[PDB]
Design an enzyme around this catalytic site. Structure first.
Site, short mmCIF file in Angstrom:
data_model
loop_
_atom_site.label_atom_id
_atom_site.label_comp_id
_atom_site.label_asym_id
_atom_site.label_seq_id
_atom_site.Cartn_x
_atom_site.Cartn_y
_atom_site.Cartn_z
N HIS A 40 45.17 51.91 32.31
CA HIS A 40 46.05 51.59 31.18
C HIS A 40 46.72 52.83 30.64
O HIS A 40 47.91 52.82 30.35
CB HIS A 40 45.27 50.97 30.03
N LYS B 157 38.14 33.85 23.81
CA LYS B 157 37.33 34.89 24.44
C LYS B 157 37.17 36.12 23.55
O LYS B 157 37.96 37.05 23.62
CB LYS B 157 37.94 35.31 25.78
N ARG C 121 48.77 46.24 40.09
CA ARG C 121 47.96 46.82 41.16
C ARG C 121 48.26 46.23 42.53
O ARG C 121 48.30 46.93 43.53
CB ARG C 121 46.47 46.63 40.84
N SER D 58 39.27 46.58 33.08
CA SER D 58 38.33 46.55 31.97
C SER D 58 37.11 45.70 32.33
O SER D 58 35.97 46.11 32.13
CB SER D 58 39.01 46.00 30.72
N1 LIG Z 1 44.31 50.18 36.97
C1 LIG Z 1 45.48 49.67 36.41
N2 LIG Z 1 46.70 50.26 36.70
C2 LIG Z 1 47.81 49.80 36.18
N3 LIG Z 1 47.84 48.75 35.36
C3 LIG Z 1 46.69 48.11 35.03
C4 LIG Z 1 45.45 48.56 35.55
N4 LIG Z 1 44.49 47.71 35.04
C5 LIG Z 1 45.08 46.80 34.24
N5 LIG Z 1 46.42 47.02 34.24
C6 LIG Z 1 47.37 46.31 33.50
O1 LIG Z 1 47.11 46.38 32.23
C7 LIG Z 1 47.22 44.87 31.69
C8 LIG Z 1 46.40 44.63 30.64
O2 LIG Z 1 45.02 44.83 31.03
P1 LIG Z 1 43.87 43.97 30.29
O3 LIG Z 1 44.18 43.86 28.85
O4 LIG Z 1 42.52 44.64 30.48
C9 LIG Z 1 43.82 42.33 31.11
P2 LIG Z 1 44.10 40.86 30.04
O5 LIG Z 1 45.58 40.46 30.03
O6 LIG Z 1 43.72 41.20 28.61
O7 LIG Z 1 43.20 39.65 30.51
P3 LIG Z 1 43.44 38.82 31.83
O8 LIG Z 1 42.59 39.36 32.89
O9 LIG Z 1 43.08 37.33 31.57
O10 LIG Z 1 44.89 38.93 32.24
C10 LIG Z 1 46.92 44.03 32.96
O11 LIG Z 1 47.53 42.69 32.84
C11 LIG Z 1 47.54 44.70 33.93
O12 LIG Z 1 48.93 44.39 33.90
#
Ligand SMILES: Nc1ncnc2c1ncn2[C@@H]1O[C@H](COP(=O)(O)CP(=O)(O)OP(=O)(O)O)[C@@H](O)[C@H]1O
Ligand SMILES: Nc1ncnc2c1ncn2[C@@H]1O[C@H](COP(=O)(O)CP(=O)(O)OP(=O)(O)O)[C@@H](O)[C@H]1O
Ligand SMILES: Nc1ncnc2c1ncn2[C@@H]1O[C@H](COP(=O)(O)CP(=O)(O)OP(=O)(O)O)[C@@H](O)[C@H]1O
Ligand SMILES: Nc1ncnc2c1ncn2[C@@H]1O[C@H](COP(=O)(O)CP(=O)(O)OP(=O)(O)O)[C@@H](O)[C@H]1O
Ligand SMILES: Nc1ncnc2c1ncn2[C@@H]1O[C@H](COP(=O)(O)CP(=O)(O)OP(=O)(O)O)[C@@H](O)[C@H]1O
Ligand SMILES: Nc1ncnc2c1ncn2[C@@H]1O[C@H](COP(=O)(O)CP(=O)(O)OP(=O)(O)O)[C@@H](O)[C@H]1O
Ligand SMILES: CC(C)(COP(=O)(O)O)[C@@H](O)C(=O)NCCC(=O)NCCS
Ligand SMILES: CC(C)(COP(=O)(O)O)[C@@H](O)C(=O)NCCC(=O)NCCS
Ligand SMILES: CC(C)(COP(=O)(O)O)[C@@H](O)C(=O)NCCC(=O)NCCS
Ligand SMILES: CC(C)(COP(=O)(O)O)[C@@H](O)C(=O)NCCC(=O)NCCS
Ligand SMILES: CC(C)(COP(=O)(O)O)[C@@H](O)C(=O)NCCC(=O)NCCS
Ligand SMILES: CC(C)(COP(=O)(O)O)[C@@H](O)C(=O)NCCC(=O)NCCS
Lengths: 157, 157, 154, 154, 157, 157
Positions: free
Chosen positions: A17, A41, A90, A127
Site C-alpha cells: 500500500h 466486517k 497485483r 493485509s
Molecule cells: N502488494 C500490493 N501492491 C499494490 N497494491 C496492493 C497491494 N496489496 C493491496 N493492494 C491494493 O490496495 C487495495 C486496498 O487493499 P485492502 O484495503 O487491504 C483490500 P479491501 O478492499 O479492503 O478488501 P477486499 O479484499 O474485500 O477487497 C487493494 O484493493 C488493492 O487494490
C-alpha cells in the site's frame, strides 16, 4: 489542481500500500487515502488505529492526507472536488475485477481510475495474508511499515 | 508541473486511444503523446500522417502535445523532465504483459506507469484489428476518428 | 533423501488429488500428505482415512493432519518443498502469492503440477454439490470415497 | 536417485533462470540444464558456457545442448521430470498445454515453480532489448553474462 | 426442435442478461430462461417478481419463456427435452470458472454449454454490483430494464 | 432454419476440432465448416486436402458441410444466410482474444459468436503442436482422427 483518492480498508496498511501511496503522491498535487469502513466486517484495527498507522507511514509525503469514508466511493471523491481514484494491482485477475468497478464508477459519476502495478518485492503482500501468517507466529516485519508491526504484536497477544 | 507521456505506434490512432488521451489530459497538467517509431519496420502511415491524425482529433485538449521518438521510452520521458507513462488496458492478458514492462521501466529509470481501463464501447478496438477489418471491406467508421477513416481507406486503395 | 508435502483440506479426496499424490511420489523419495484442519463434510480422521485407502500402492507416502502454518508443518518434518496441483491460470495467480509468502517466511519452496486433462473440472466442492442433488460422480472419485460419500448422504 | 531437466533457450541466462536452477538443484539429486537449439544472440556454446559459470556452486547440476523433442532429451538421460519457472497466469495457460502434451506422448511430468518476486519482470528478450538501447540490466543478469553482454554489443 | 436454457438467479435481470436472451432467441427455435432459486437463501426479489421483470422486458421475443427451478441445472434442461445451456461471459476469469461447470455438466448428463461474449456496453454490469451501487444512491438507470429500475429502488426504500 | 459457421485453418483437423463440430451439429439445423486460406502462411496440407480430411472425419454428421473461404469471415457467414459463428475455446487467454474478435464481428455485421469449452481430453491439442510433435517422431495418433494421421505420415516422409 490535480488529485486522486486511494481507497481501501488498510487493516493494516502494508508496504505494498505504502508503495502505491508514494507513487500517487509523486504525480498528483494531492492524494487522499480513504479508509473505508464496512459495519459487517469489523477487522482487527479500528478506523482510527488504521488512520494513525497510515499517517505515521506516510509522514514524509506532505501532499497526502488520510480520512475515513463511508457510502458510495464516487460521492466521497466528488465531494472533495476530485474525479480520480488510484489503486494498486497485483494480478490479471485483480485487473479483470477492478476493471468492472472502474467502468461502473466512471459510468455513474464520471470518476476515473488509474491503476499502478505492484512493486515486485511486495507482489505477494496483502493485509489479510500478513495477518494470517502473523497469527500463527510468522515473521511479517519486512512486509509492513515499522509503525504497524509493533501494534500488530499488541493485538495478537 | 505534473505530466504524463502516452506512448504507442498509433498506426492509426483509434477512438480507444483518444479516450485515453482525453482522460490523461483531464488528470495531469500536461500530456505528451509519444509516437514511437521503429526505424527498421515501416507501418501503414508515415510519422507525419500519424501525428496529423492525432492532432486533428485532439484540438480540444489545450494541454496535450504530440511528438515522435524512438529507442527507450523511459529516455523520451526523462529527457522531457517527466516521470510518468499513461497506458490504456483492455484485458487481464494485457495487464500481465504490461506489468513486466512497467516494472522494468521503473527499475531502470524510476519512471512510473499509470494504467486506465478501456472505455466499454471501445474494448474491442485495436489499430491492428481495425486495419485488418478495413483491408477486407469491413465497416470501421464508428471505431476511428474522422481524421483517420478516409486516410485509411485511401491507403488501402 | 528428497521429500515433499502435499497439503489440502481434501474433503473428500478426489482422483485429481490422487493423481497429484502419485506424481509427487514418483519424483520424491518421501511424500507427506497434510490434511489441514480448518466448511466441512468429512471428519479430519475420515479424510485421513479416505486418503490412506486410495494411496495403498504408494510406499513412500504417508498421511498426517495439521494445524497452524503449513511451512511449520513442512519444516518440523525436515522438508522444505510443497507440491500442489493447478487447474487454471486463476489458480496459479492465487497460489503464486501463497508460494512467495511461504518462501519468504520460511524458505519453503512450492512446486506446481498441471492437472491431468481428464480431471480438469474435478474439485471436492463441485463433486459434493453435484452428488448432493443426485449426480453421478463415480468416475471422479476413488472407489474408497465413492461408497462413503453415498452413505454420508444416505 | 531423483532428477529433473530445466529446459530453455537461455539467450542469455538471467538471474530468473539461475534462481530456478538453484531451487531445482535443492530438491532433486540431479539437475540437467537443457539448452535447446532453435531468434538468437549468443551461440549455443556461449549460452552453455554462460550457464556453466553461473552455476559453479551447484554440484549436482550440468549443462547440455539439445535437439529434437524435449521429452526424448529427458528420457534418453533416464529422467521423467521437467522443471520450469512461471511468472504469470498467462505463462501457466501456455505451459499447461505443453506439459500435458509431454505427459501424453512420453509420460514425462512437469513441475512449475513461481518466479522469485524480485525477478518477476526479467526475461532474456526484455533484458536484451533494454541493453540494446543502453539500459542498465546489471542487477538482473549474472556477473558472468553481464560482461559478455556489454562486449557483445560493443 | 432446437432449444436452449438460459440460467441465472436474475435478482434482478439486467440489460446484460436481456442482451444474452435476445441473442439466444435469435439462434435457437426456443429459449427457456431458468430462474434458479436456492430454497435456503432468499434474495432481494421473490420468484414472482423475478419472473415478472423478465417477462415484461422480453415481450418482443415470441420464442422465449420463463420458468423457475432448483437443484441441478442439467435435470431442469433434460426434463424439458433440451440439451443446451447458453450463458454470457464477461472475462477470462469467468471463462475459467464456467469451463469447469460446463465440463462437469457435459460429463454427468451430456448437456452442452454455449457461451456468448458480453455486449461491450454492458461488460461491467452485474446484478450484485447494480444492487450495491443502488443501495448507496448511485444511478443505475441505464443498466437495468424499465421493468426493474423502480421495483429495485422501491425495495431499497 | 438455424445454423452456424465453424471457421479455422484446420491444418490438419484434430479431435479437438471434431468435438466442436459434433457439438455444433447437435444444436443447429446446419453447420458450415469454413476452411480459411491465408496466402501468407501456406501450411502443411492444401485447402482441398484439409477439406477432404474434415469431410471424412465428419462423415456421420449429415447436417455439416465443408467449404473453403477467403476474405471477411462475416461476409462468408452472411452470404450463406446465417449470422452465427461457433468456436471452441481452451483457456481464459483464448477467451480474452476471441472476445475482441467476437465483439468486432457483431459490431461490423451483426454476426454473433457462440463459444464452447474444449473437451477435457483434448484440452492440450492444437494443429500446430501436434505437427511439431509428429515432426520429431512423437505419436499423436490419439489426438487426431483416423483419416488424418495416415496422410500426416506421408507428408513427414
Ligand atoms: N502488494 C500490493 N501492491 C499494490 N497494491 C496492493 C497491494 N496489496 C493491496 N493492494 C491494493 O490496495 C487495495 C486496498 O487493499 P485492502 O484495503 O487491504 C483490500 P479491501 O478492499 O479492503 O478488501 P477486499 O479484499 O474485500 O477487497 C487493494 O484493493 C488493492 O487494490
Ligand atoms: N481500445 C483501447 N482502449 C484503451 N487503450 C487502448 C486501446 N487500444 C490500444 N490501447 C492502448 O494503446 C497502446 C498503444 O496502441 P498501438 O499504438 O495501436 C500498438 P503498440 O504501441 O505496439 O502497443 P504495445 O506494444 O504496448 O502492445 C496499447 O499498448 C494499448 O496500451
Ligand atoms: N483436479 C485437480 N488436479 C490437480 N490438482 C487439483 C485438482 N483439484 C484440486 N487440486 C489441488 O489440490 C488442492 C486441494 O484442494 P481441496 O483442499 O480438496 C479444495 P480447495 O479448493 O483447496 O478449498 P478452498 O478453495 O476453500 O481453499 C487444491 O487447492 C488444488 O491446489
Ligand atoms: N524471471 C523468471 N523467473 C522464473 N522463471 C523464468 C523467468 N524467466 C523465464 N523463466 C523461465 O525460464 C524459461 C526459459 O526462458 P528463455 O528460454 O530464456 C526465453 P523464452 O520465453 O522461453 O522464449 P520463447 O518465448 O520464444 O519460447 C521460460 O520459458 C520460462 O519458463
Ligand atoms: N453483463 C453481462 N453480460 C453477459 N452476461 C452476463 C452479464 N452479467 C451476468 N451475465 C450472465 O448472466 C449469469 C447469471 O447472472 P446472475 O443471475 O445475476 C448471478 P449467478 O446466476 O449466480 O451466476 P453464476 O453463479 O453462474 O456466476 C451469469 O452467470 C453470467 O453468466
Ligand atoms: N482442442 C481444442 N478444443 C476446442 N477447440 C479448439 C481446440 N483446438 C483448436 N480449437 C479451436 O479451433 C479453432 C481453429 O483451429 P485452427 O484452425 O487450427 C487455428 P488458426 O485460426 O487457423 O490459426 P491461429 O493459431 O493463428 O489462430 C481455434 O481458433 C480454436 O478456436
Ligand atoms: C472498498 C472498495 C474500494 C473495494 O475495492 P478494493 O478491494 O479495490 O479496495 C469498494 O468496495 C468501494 O468502492 N466501496 C465503497 C462503496 C461503493 O462505491 N461501491 C460501488 C463500487 S463500483
Ligand atoms: C515495447 C514498446 C512497443 C511498448 O511501448 P508502446 O506500445 O507504448 O509504444 C516500445 O515502443 C517502448 O515502450 N519503448 C521502445 C523500446 C523500450 O522502451 N523497451 C523497454 C520496455 S520495458
Ligand atoms: C490449507 C492451505 C494449504 C490451503 O490449502 P487448500 O487450497 O487445499 O485449501 C492454506 O490455507 C494453508 O497453508 N493453511 C495453513 C495456515 C497457513 O500456512 N497460512 C499461510 C499461507 S501463506
Ligand atoms: C524449447 C522448449 C522447451 C520451449 O522452451 P522455452 O520456453 O524456454 O523457449 C520447447 O519449445 C521444446 O520442447 N522444444 C523442443 C521440441 C519439443 O519438445 N516440442 C514439443 C513441445 S510439447
Ligand atoms: C452453480 C449455479 C449457481 C450456476 O448456474 P446459474 O448461475 O446459471 O444459476 C447453479 O444455479 C446451477 O447451475 N445449478 C444448481 C446446482 C448445479 O447445477 N450444480 C452443478 C454445476 S456443474
Ligand atoms: C481465421 C480467423 C477466424 C482466426 O480466428 P481463429 O484463430 O479462432 O480461427 C480470423 O482470422 C478470421 O476471421 N479471418 C477472416 C478475415 C476476418 O474476418 N478478419 C476480421 C476478424 S474480426
Amino acid at each position: 489542481m490535480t488529485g486522486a483518492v486511494c481507497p481501501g480498508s488498510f487493516d493494516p496498511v502494508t508496504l505494498g500500500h505504502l508503495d502505491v501511496f508514494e507513487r500517487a503522491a509523486a504525480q498528483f498535487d494531492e492524494v487522499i487515502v480513504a479508509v473505508l469502513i464496512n459495519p459487517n466486517k469489523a477487522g482487527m484495527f479500528t478506523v482510527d488505529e488504521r488512520i494513525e498507522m497510515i499517517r505515521e507511514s506516510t509522514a514524509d509525503l506532505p501532499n497526502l492526507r488520510v480520512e475515513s469514508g463511508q457510502g458510495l466511493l464516487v460521492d466521497f471523491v466528488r465531494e472533495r472536488g476530485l474525479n480520480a481514484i488510484v489503486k494498486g494491482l497485483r494480478t490479471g485477475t485483480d485487473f479483470e475485477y477492478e476493471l468492472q468497478m472502474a467502468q461502473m464508477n466512471k459510468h455513474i459519476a464520471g470518476v476515473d481510475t488509474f491503476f499502478v502495478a505492484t512493486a515486485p518485492a511486495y507482489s505477494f503482500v496483502s493485509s489479510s495474508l500478513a495477518k494470517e501468517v502473523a497469527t500463527y507466529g510468522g515473521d511479517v516485519s519486512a512486509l509492513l511499515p515499522a509503525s504497524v508491526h509493533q501494534r500488530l504484536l499488541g493485538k495478537l497477544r
